[model samples]
Target: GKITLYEDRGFQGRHYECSSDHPNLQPYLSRCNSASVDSGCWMLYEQPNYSGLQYFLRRGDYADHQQWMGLSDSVRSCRLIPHSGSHRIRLYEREDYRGQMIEFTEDCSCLQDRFRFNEIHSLNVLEGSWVLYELSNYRGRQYLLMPGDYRRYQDWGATNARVGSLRRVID
Candidate 1:
């Protein structure tokens, strides 16, 4: 779970290393220009309080922000996703787990084709934490979901009901 954040591109310059979640990562390194993700998945925040812009990262070497689809170079907080043995979630077309429903437990792409819906109204995260993407191919808005019940899309802090893809928060 070692991740090295370099102060310069191509993994050069004074790098900062860590393997845990951080709420306020100030006074460590001014900025992270490049990163080497040896193992584990991570979610980087633009603000120190884990708010603002978001960028999810898997194991890989990111020479620049574009590679990680970063909107900004300032990563003030980070979260190392816990490894989950299994993942499971239920999506409902109506609120309160009503109407059309389907279940999934993998790193899947667009499922609206099978789910037959433009948007889902509610969700039940039965096992493990997952992230819901607004568009297909794991792109667009990301909403973190732990094992719990989301009675409505707003319960997940979403401005609307749109879930194009979803995946587990695993290493």
Candidate 2:
């Protein structure tokens, strides 16, 4: 899988190509104003080392930052999501899968409103690809998940355990 980042929109100006997970992208380019994912799905972070706001991108062309829900055009890090099968996930309110737990095979626009919990301390993905959001209605920080067990917030490379929404990747 590969992702190409551009310094300016419309795929112009200085560009950096990546074929693997990049914890920090500051050295590659100051910021990413636009992007092109030529191969697989990817997660772009607003800050370095996969911290801060996040945006999900499958194989496609993002002409500008606005294409990603009008997020700031500064992508500082990125990670490619490996291909997977049917999606199934379990979200928990405490670490080690403790506290309130809920399973979902479909998208949830607002987990807080639907499940009455806004913070997900741990998670387990049993089947496919999914994206967890920091805010309701699939907005804010995005965390991409594949079939695996994430016992804590940091396990998914998130600085916080707060999650308000979730959605499966149809690709």
Candidate 3:
């Protein structure tokens, strides 16, 4: 995947091209105010070493920080997301993939109404790609997940165990 980070808004000023995972982009640039994703999906981090708030980016143009769901114009790291097929996920009510568990074959609009739980501490993505939203009906902050096992909220790059809705990434 190809992506460009800009130091100024509207794709102007100093910029850097990133085609692979960058755990610490301080060597090239100190901050990223805007971004442009030419192809593939990506995850941007607010802090270096791949820690802190995350932003999911698909193939598109984010002329400014606002377009990228960022509260500030400071991006420190990023990683490309490889595509995976199908959708089968298991969610847990507690950390380490423990406590009450529920398997889902289709998208869930509101986990609170369906599962009677508002927090998801762990999860297992058995197949395909998926995106978890912090609000119902697929609105609010989101976190992307590929096929893998996430034993805790931190494994999925979440600061808290709150997931209100989820959907498979078919495209």
Candidate 4:
């Protein structure tokens, strides 16, 4: 069974790789296309392993453009725990290049993804911390996020007018 992250209202997201639901660990959910007012917004997703982590900064917005990180990783299909507060996302550690705690702007626009955040060695993390994976400029080899995240990146552009583009699917 995959892991699922559920918003207290019953909204849930599934993590196929882990095959486990997040349960009460996530107490809030964001409605699709609507601005989220409540914190504790959680979603179920595959806990990124090393192999997938390699694409951390090369696959999505970070690769495509620079301004996107100001927003958080989002999608209606999967549960993503927003990054904020004490949960610092590390970038480029000795064991991993995707090490570095991410800090959000005062407006909460910039964001990162969990693949980069999980690499952090600290348990003193918070739920609202956002993680924006690095994006790319190339046209091919998209789907680095697979299934759900790719869709949300599109929504970010469509809904917020944030510029975004999905890398071409891998051949």
lDDT of 1 by residue, 21-132 (tens): 9888777877877888999888877779777666778899999877787866798888887777889999999999999999998877986767888799999998988888
Q: Comparing 1 and 4 by lDDT, which wins?
A: 1
lDDT of 4 by residue, 8-117 (tens): 22232432222222323222434211122132332322222211111112112121111222123332233333323432322222222223433222222222222233
Which consecutive 10 residues in model 2 have the weakest lDDT in total? 79-88
Q: For residues 1-171, could you state the per-residue lDDT of candidate 2 as single tens digits?
A: 888999998999999999999998898798778889898888888888877777888888999897876468778888887666677899998999999899998889989776777688999999888988888988877778888899999988789878999988765
TM-score for all predictions? 0.87, 0.80, 0.86, 0.22
Candidate 2 residues lying further than 4 Å off, grouped into runs, are 69-71
Tens digits of per-residue lDDT for model 3, 1-171: 899999989988989999998999878877788899888788888889877777888888998887878888878989787766667999999988788989887999999887878889999999887888888987777787888889988787778888999987653
Candidate 1 Cα outliers beyond 4 Å, as residue runs: none
Could you say which candidate leads in lDDT? Answer: 2
What's the residue-level lDDT of 58 in candidate 1?
85
Cα displacement (Å) at residue 89, model 3: 1.2
lDDT of each: 0.84, 0.85, 0.85, 0.25
Q: What is the Å distance of residue 27 in model 4 from its true position?
A: 20
Q: Give lDDT for model 3.
A: 0.85
Rank order (by lDDT, best first): 2, 3, 1, 4
Worst 10 residues of 4 by lDDT: 50-59
